[PDB]
Design an enzyme around this catalytic site. Structure first.
Site, mmCIF file in Angstrom:
data_model
loop_
_atom_site.group_PDB
_atom_site.id
_atom_site.type_symbol
_atom_site.label_atom_id
_atom_site.label_comp_id
_atom_site.label_asym_id
_atom_site.label_seq_id
_atom_site.Cartn_x
_atom_site.Cartn_y
_atom_site.Cartn_z
ATOM 1 N N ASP A 45 0.793 -1.229 0.000
ATOM 2 C CA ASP A 45 0.000 0.000 0.000
ATOM 3 C C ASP A 45 0.813 1.260 0.000
ATOM 4 O O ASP A 45 1.255 1.776 1.035
ATOM 5 C CB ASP A 45 -0.863 -0.088 1.272
ATOM 6 C CG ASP A 45 -1.947 0.980 1.255
ATOM 7 O OD1 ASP A 45 -1.904 1.876 0.354
ATOM 8 O OD2 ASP A 45 -2.801 0.894 2.156
ATOM 9 N N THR A 46 1.027 1.838 -1.203
ATOM 10 C CA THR A 46 1.857 3.037 -1.288
ATOM 11 C C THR A 46 1.175 4.253 -0.690
ATOM 12 O O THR A 46 1.866 5.240 -0.401
ATOM 13 C CB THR A 46 2.233 3.341 -2.749
ATOM 14 O OG1 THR A 46 1.024 3.509 -3.509
ATOM 15 C CG2 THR A 46 3.039 2.194 -3.363
ATOM 16 N N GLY A 47 -0.133 4.208 -0.486
ATOM 17 C CA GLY A 47 -0.877 5.272 0.188
ATOM 18 C C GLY A 47 -0.856 5.195 1.694
ATOM 19 O O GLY A 47 -1.463 6.069 2.350
HETATM 20 C C1 LIG Z 1 -13.065 1.379 -2.624
HETATM 21 O O1 LIG Z 1 -12.075 2.379 -2.791
HETATM 22 C C2 LIG Z 1 -11.466 2.740 -1.629
HETATM 23 C C3 LIG Z 1 -11.762 2.219 -0.379
HETATM 24 C C4 LIG Z 1 -10.928 2.548 0.708
HETATM 25 C C5 LIG Z 1 -9.858 3.416 0.578
HETATM 26 S S1 LIG Z 1 -8.784 3.778 1.919
HETATM 27 O O2 LIG Z 1 -8.315 5.179 1.806
HETATM 28 O O3 LIG Z 1 -9.477 3.377 3.163
HETATM 29 N N1 LIG Z 1 -7.472 2.800 1.772
HETATM 30 C C6 LIG Z 1 -7.744 1.370 1.764
HETATM 31 C C7 LIG Z 1 -6.811 0.527 2.654
HETATM 32 C C8 LIG Z 1 -6.962 0.862 4.132
HETATM 33 C C9 LIG Z 1 -7.081 -0.970 2.377
HETATM 34 C C10 LIG Z 1 -6.339 3.298 1.039
HETATM 35 C C11 LIG Z 1 -5.127 3.481 1.970
HETATM 36 O O4 LIG Z 1 -3.960 3.594 1.141
HETATM 37 C C12 LIG Z 1 -5.258 4.707 2.877
HETATM 38 C C13 LIG Z 1 -5.149 6.043 2.116
HETATM 39 C C14 LIG Z 1 -5.332 7.228 3.103
HETATM 40 C C15 LIG Z 1 -6.628 7.621 3.489
HETATM 41 C C16 LIG Z 1 -6.830 8.666 4.401
HETATM 42 C C17 LIG Z 1 -5.715 9.309 4.948
HETATM 43 C C18 LIG Z 1 -4.427 8.929 4.582
HETATM 44 C C19 LIG Z 1 -4.237 7.912 3.650
HETATM 45 N N2 LIG Z 1 -4.180 4.644 3.907
HETATM 46 C C20 LIG Z 1 -4.365 4.220 5.150
HETATM 47 O O5 LIG Z 1 -5.432 3.846 5.627
HETATM 48 O O6 LIG Z 1 -3.235 4.226 5.928
HETATM 49 C C21 LIG Z 1 -3.480 3.881 7.296
HETATM 50 C C22 LIG Z 1 -4.048 5.079 8.013
HETATM 51 C C23 LIG Z 1 -2.869 5.999 8.252
HETATM 52 N N3 LIG Z 1 -2.561 6.880 7.147
HETATM 53 C C24 LIG Z 1 -1.410 6.602 6.548
HETATM 54 O O7 LIG Z 1 -0.843 7.140 5.557
HETATM 55 O O8 LIG Z 1 -0.825 5.594 7.210
HETATM 56 C C25 LIG Z 1 -1.635 5.115 8.278
HETATM 57 C C26 LIG Z 1 -2.106 3.704 7.930
HETATM 58 C C27 LIG Z 1 -9.599 3.964 -0.674
HETATM 59 C C28 LIG Z 1 -10.394 3.637 -1.773
#
Ligand SMILES: COc1ccc(S(=O)(=O)N(CC(C)C)C[C@@H](O)[C@H](Cc2ccccc2)NC(=O)O[C@@H]2C[C@@H]3NC(=O)O[C@@H]3C2)cc1
Ligand SMILES: [Cl-]
Ligand SMILES: [Cl-]
Ligand code: NA
Ligand code: NA
Lengths: 99, 99
Positions: free
Chosen positions: A25-27
């Site tokens: 997960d690059t996000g």
């Molecule tokens: C159906 O399409 C979707 C459904 C869910 C999401 S998401 O944003 O919930 N997500 C899904 C995963 C959790 C499976 C994408 C993630 O990349 C999300 C992307 C994201 C969303 C909101 C804020 C930052 C990053 N990052 C994330 O949840 O990271 C966790 C939470 C903390 N943030 C971060 O960078 O590191 C910590 C870990 C995106 C599109």
């Protein structure tokens, strides 16, 4: 490998001797794994995702294999829809995004 | 380009006539943009992640220029804390994860 994104980039990880599935997960800044037992002390951390901020347990210097590549670093433990491998460990396995 | 993951992989996008910064996110199935107007029809959807679920508007057949590369697909619009380019559009620009 070169992983395309037509399907979720799920890989096998190994942590505590157990195989698990996780999403590369690059996000995600941070690696977050579902409830499990890890050794050592933990510290508190708040992380913010799509639906808001929550509390997780931060374990430092944990040995984890990701798609066959060894990493040693921070793992957060808490509620997540899927185990996620974030950039803190993706950098340790030498991952880059390319287009 | 080759984008390393030492920092968040943010790029500039153009959507609905507007320039925005967005995260290239291999852990996101779908593309999610902060509130803005887009033309055409839409329907409601719920999407979930850490923190839980948010309600979004789903717009289909939207063109988005991502780091200079055009692509068309579904865009979800709603109260996300970060603009996210998910796999539905990463595939169209030929993005892969490499290690
Ligand atoms: C159906 O399409 C979707 C459904 C869910 C999401 S998401 O944003 O919930 N997500 C899904 C995963 C959790 C499976 C994408 C993630 O990349 C999300 C992307 C994201 C969303 C909101 C804020 C930052 C990053 N990052 C994330 O949840 O990271 C966790 C939470 C903390 N943030 C971060 O960078 O590191 C910590 C870990 C995106 C599109
Ligand atoms: Cl699409
Ligand atoms: Cl391809
Ligand atoms: Na530790
Ligand atoms: Na449309």
């Amino acid at each position: 490998p070169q992983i395309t994104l037509w399907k979720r980039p799920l890989v096998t990880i190994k942590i505590g001797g157990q195989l698990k599935e996780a999403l590369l997960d690059t996000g995600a800044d941070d690696t977050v794994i579902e409830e499990m037992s890890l050794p050592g002390r933990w510290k508190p951390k708040m992380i913010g995702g799509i639906g808001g901020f929550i509390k997780v347990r931060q374990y430092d210097q944990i040995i984890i294999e990701i798609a066959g590549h060894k990493a040693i670093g921070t793992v957060l433990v808490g509620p997540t829809p899927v185990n996620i491998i974030g950039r803190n460990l993706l950098t340790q396995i030498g991952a880059t995004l390319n287009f």
